Design a protein around this ligand. Sequence first.
Ligand SMILES: [Fe+3]
Ligand SMILES: [Fe+3]
Ligand SMILES: [Fe+3]
Ligand SMILES: [Fe+3]
Lengths: 238, 238, 238, 238, 202, 202, 202, 202
Amino acid sequence: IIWGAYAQRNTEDHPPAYAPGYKTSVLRSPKNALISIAETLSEVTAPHFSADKFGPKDNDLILNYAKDGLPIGERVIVHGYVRDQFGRPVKNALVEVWQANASGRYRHPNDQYIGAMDPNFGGCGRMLTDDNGYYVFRTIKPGPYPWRNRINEWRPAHIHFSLIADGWAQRLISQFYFEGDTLIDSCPILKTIPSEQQRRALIALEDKSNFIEADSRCYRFDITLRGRRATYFENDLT
Amino acid sequence: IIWGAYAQRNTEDHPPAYAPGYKTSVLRSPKNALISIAETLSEVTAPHFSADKFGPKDNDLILNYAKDGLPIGERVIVHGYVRDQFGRPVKNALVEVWQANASGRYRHPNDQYIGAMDPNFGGCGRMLTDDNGYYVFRTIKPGPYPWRNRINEWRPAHIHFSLIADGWAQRLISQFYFEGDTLIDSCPILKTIPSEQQRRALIALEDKSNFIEADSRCYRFDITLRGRRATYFENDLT
Amino acid sequence: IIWGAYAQRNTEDHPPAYAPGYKTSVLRSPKNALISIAETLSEVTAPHFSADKFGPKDNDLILNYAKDGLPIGERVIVHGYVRDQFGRPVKNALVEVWQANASGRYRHPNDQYIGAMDPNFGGCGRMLTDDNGYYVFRTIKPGPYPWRNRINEWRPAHIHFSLIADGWAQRLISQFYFEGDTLIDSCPILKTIPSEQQRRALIALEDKSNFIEADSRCYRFDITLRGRRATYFENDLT
Amino acid sequence: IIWGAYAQRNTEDHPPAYAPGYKTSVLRSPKNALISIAETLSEVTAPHFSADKFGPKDNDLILNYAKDGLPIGERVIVHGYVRDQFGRPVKNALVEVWQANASGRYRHPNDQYIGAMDPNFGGCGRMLTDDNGYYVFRTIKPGPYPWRNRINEWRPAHIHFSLIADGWAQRLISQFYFEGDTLIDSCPILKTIPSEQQRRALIALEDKSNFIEADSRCYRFDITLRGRRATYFENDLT
Amino acid sequence: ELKETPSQTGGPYVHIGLLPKQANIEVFEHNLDNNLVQDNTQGQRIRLEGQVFDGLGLPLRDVLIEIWQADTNGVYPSQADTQGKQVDPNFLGWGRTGADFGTGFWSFNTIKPGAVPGRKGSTQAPHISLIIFAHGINIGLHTRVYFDDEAEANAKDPVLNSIEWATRRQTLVAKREERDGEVVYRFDIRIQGENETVFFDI
Amino acid sequence: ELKETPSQTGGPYVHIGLLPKQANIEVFEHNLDNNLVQDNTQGQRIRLEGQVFDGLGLPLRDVLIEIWQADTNGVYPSQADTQGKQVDPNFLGWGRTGADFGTGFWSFNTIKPGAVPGRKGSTQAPHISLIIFAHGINIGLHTRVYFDDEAEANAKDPVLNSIEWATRRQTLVAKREERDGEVVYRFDIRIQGENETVFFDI
Amino acid sequence: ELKETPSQTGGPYVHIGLLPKQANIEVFEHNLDNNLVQDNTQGQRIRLEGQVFDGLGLPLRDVLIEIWQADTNGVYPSQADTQGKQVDPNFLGWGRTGADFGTGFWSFNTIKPGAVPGRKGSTQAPHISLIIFAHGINIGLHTRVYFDDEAEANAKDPVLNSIEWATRRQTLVAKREERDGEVVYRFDIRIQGENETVFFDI
Amino acid sequence: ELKETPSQTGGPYVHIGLLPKQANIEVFEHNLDNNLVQDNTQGQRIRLEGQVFDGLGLPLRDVLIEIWQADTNGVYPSQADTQGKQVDPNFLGWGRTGADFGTGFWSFNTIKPGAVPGRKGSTQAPHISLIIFAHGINIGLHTRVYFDDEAEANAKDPVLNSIEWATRRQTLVAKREERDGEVVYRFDIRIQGENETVFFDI
Ligand SMILES: [Fe+3]
Ligand SMILES: [Fe+3]
Ligand SMILES: [Fe+3]
Ligand SMILES: [Fe+3]
């Protein structure tokens, strides 16, 4: 099997750069169209991160920053699979996540919301997917929070995530939401995505059989990255 | 206007006493049918509670037990109207509420769930409705929590409430839930209610125009009590 | 009752500033996003206008400029109610209106349309709403008129109106149209409004029971302004 | 991979213990609710049966009791897959079956129905599923038969089956029916199952491509057992 | 017309909210409790006590009970009382209690109520209206407590006489006892089974 | 995700298929039965016997029973046992029996099991897991048999202690008897009614 | 809940209706105008003037402008003002004007406002709230005018500080000039483009 | 076939998660950073620095930047590199940094990359692939950094030559500077407006 380039990114499946309802995008979006290039080794390669460097609690946001006790909030497990667009598992990809605490408050200098800080919660984790593209992490469900776009704007509860996988062209950062959150319908950030089916692709689903009795709930959430095509005739990559 | 009796309670609008899917009800439900009586002064009267005895923070669950800081969790205001079945406001009724904290943990001796306790949260409040039947209180949204009915049973997030109003026959205790919570569909306690329209009568609705920017969300929830009929001919109450 | 801020303006219920089909907006719309602010006394206050200063014919466009006779055209009464978004009446608000005559001609220097001027018609009126938010005025139905956007553009018949009420944040200018006018479907100005339900909110409805025999027809038209929320906890306005 | 407990049995997917239309259940069903327990090694383990002890005709009900000739009736092959609820194959599970003969008569002391006994038919078989969860056995299609529940009650044709697999919590006995049998719609035993979709889960489907020309028909029937969840954090089983 | 909001069980913690002080939660300055006797309250002081049993005979240690009753002269401290007589001004007529977590015993300190008019000119025997909430009870259960030393009045009580099973009427009669000068009425409640207490739809 | 195949009663002939040899059907060379003791099996031999009663007190003569248990050292003969200890190699840990058609008596010859680890570092008292199938029983009923001579261990058993009615816990304890040198544990099962045996959802 | 009536442009003749007297239409005896100073009005008289430019830099000669402001002591002549201080009784606080058809210049005669309380105990610098309507403007544009000689107060103004681009804050500051004894503040408004004026959603 | 998960902005706190150590969150023992030079790394050490500007010319102080590049011999430390040459074993080829909260300056310490094969036998000039995430940026923006001292190679670069506007090509060339013996390449990024940096869809 000789690999060719990743399939073209389908721009209609993503938000446009300029999205006036999300005010900050007005001055941070290019006026010129993006220049599409044919891929080279630069775009189809990416770094490798060794499992050795990860600590035991890197994917356990409940315990990785706990000092005197446990963080306050809803104990939840989030798991799922990362695959490419042709359905193949994405192995040993680096998944990083970050989020607010149960009050909707970030442990960031610039966050001055009145929702209370939790001394036992940090809000960040990471993991590598396994050979089946599977990932699992545990955390506290984040609270929704206010921000200034229009004056009374509120983000639905969400977890920010980032993936570095096999090719630089697959580099992706996004956010997932929780089934049933009523704020999902009003968020200007989620509404930058043009189609309803793609907005639903960011909603993690309640996974009731996988709840752990007297302990934690569970949400299922799969991620799809761009996939590479195989070459059977001329290989022009090089 | 001479008042007669409260309208008969419509038993098909309430859960039956014996509801096998809610296991604890099996040994705590009468085998005999309830004996219906015609009302007397005993059933149409009720106590009066004076506003003077209530403290300033009795309806503010965010601050009424705060010691060193604020409780952790989602700041929410809940408000609405209490009326009787004929649509009249219920004035100066005593509304009491109680609930778990953001972790789904009760500040009760017998609660040993691993969800963390919050030293700045108590979980109970009370208020009297005003002349328009209006009530308002502020709290932390409670987390869902596990309990043993079947081994992996989970209550949706909920607030327990109790009303003492004008007549003893109106005495009611119940619980309300939050729009969109996916656990609402699986709860055996909520399913003791026979009809879908009555189960929806316990769901508090997101009230977005009433959110307070950079501060709190808001839910609207109205309550209906039994109403009295007027007498225009013979008054047999006495 | 202690008042807080007006609810946030819902921008999706209004036209955007830049609307290319309405050509004049291209150079008169800001490139930057509007900056949302939290309200202060500046935004929640507004002036008061005394009824004493209004003349008897200020709301009678049929007679307030009549010199030798009556203006030519369709005699119509327009009435309705002004309320805020939570349904409360807006009392003593200043309502001002202006419009073309029956030919579609404005008594303005710059209007050179061939539709004939009417020496007995002025085209402007004003009134204060009463304690129930009610207003009523009488006029001549305006004719539609041509304007240069595309070369053969025609505005449907319309009356321009302006409201100054309780808070500066409620300040609003808009235009209403008449039920059934076929030009409503083609107007680029009305089409700047994104949703069909909001475009219908500007159409005054035929009110047949309120017609005055052998005299005038009548149209009903209600107006909704932003409403203030009540504060029950901290009052941060000051 | 470290295994945790089996997922909770979903009681709404099974018949209740007390089902008055099936008269024998009235005195053989507990009055108390079942007590749910958290699983221990007792519930997640089960015995192992070696293939060595099975004879060559154990899964061939046509020949395993034939003495002077072949049993009379419809030659049919039944096959399918046993998997757990998460879709994994159940390997080396013990499947046992038993049934009446073509007349609807059991070779049991207590069966006195007039349908004729078949001297060449026994009515019982067993097999172990393979590594793909596959099983296959051959038999004579059983006839429907009368029983006393109401006086003219008739069971549809059915084969009783039993599975002992990986965990004691998976222990299951049930019965499957044949596509199109009109008695399926009237059976009080099948009607103890609350939902229509679960009643259909017991109907074996005609598998025409797998019929063997001039020999036997074939029915396909899959079975789903409870599945175990994987543990990624604390392992509390021990 | 609207439908009544549906009832739901109070659940196992019905005291965080209804009796916080005894779940050791100090949020309120003024707390509601099981003592209906104030210093100037008129009438004879009595103690009402008992236990609540499930269908296997085990006391419920998580139950919440409230009582509602008239004053010594049979007048309710409610604007809805239409007798036109003045009520004892130092009497709320209501109280709330939980069962002791260890024993299951519950009690109230109150006064013996006077007779209250019944419908159509009848007279009811002295009674206390009682309601029970607990985990497993989907709707509060209403019952009444009558007194065994008011046998003459009980015999003529409209409500008791409306119970056709004369053997069930007795489940509503509490027994007078006299512990060290104090009058005590023992009233046990059996939710289910033999000698099941009569519950009313009121 | 798939739903579990729904349970259905075993019906009145649950032995043509599960115990053919005793319905006098010779189809199999090797037959499964109620004897868990092989000649080299380790531990103390015990006989477990009893009857199963319906709601009127009549023994079921059509019932099928199976038991599942650990060896003498509390290790299960299952690949799923994770104690890392070696199990007795001459022990299947499972058996099956029917009640005698005349009397209703059922029995097993087995060994007394050793204590098995409970969850979170706890220790369970010695027990045998038991399941019952019969005409009228729509889903197999799960219960456990503990031993009356292990009172100290029973007192600390997690599962027994999770039964809040201390009177129901006793239905799970079999009584030791000594018939001619043999140790016998009598365990009667009451499916419905007074002294109804505790059944579990496992 | 109801939705706000949608905004529509005022159109090119927004003065037949809002300033008839200057479209030469005498229908009203009392006409609203751009003079907020009455003879007994307290405070320092100032003239506010400027032009409004489109995206090509051309002044709009069809624009309608209104201002809303507090009196000399920072009190609004509105029932909604909650400072509990008495307002200047000879001050409406509001005015309206159009741009001169030839030049595009607009002006108001008013008084310099006093400082008004901000949220949570803050103090706002002296400002005038201004709104612009014209053909092409679909919704009235809100902005504020601060004064360049109140640099100390401006530096601490909550609203100005909430604008993260310090270069845009300057578009809100008018320049003091002194024409023949009169104090004049020049405030030009650029609707679109370079040095575009900040507009608010209030 | 599946659709790619849709992109969403990283938001203003894209460093709690991607650079916790510099948001002062000590959760990880090993932290990823902006230093790609290990002690035995081969090649010439260079510092890459600059600022990212919005459409008004203000630096973004909340931006997150990553770079991806080949080693000194133009080989990528990736299993997907098919040149069949051995890569420098002490080189990750990737790093991540944020802009200084005060100044907006960002930097990386890395090595100047060697030339990498282009498509169909072409050769690319030395370049570093760069991606930018920030509040307001809905999808990460891809660009490349070429070096002004590789003018001969840049002139023949396939990607640069595929940009038809020769004036835009220059936005991709960083300027070499020599601060105290260290080689520094200054690369400023203008997201929007005049001299807007070229961004690619890759
Ligand atoms: Fe609860
Ligand atoms: Fe059968
Ligand atoms: Fe017009
Ligand atoms: Fe966020």
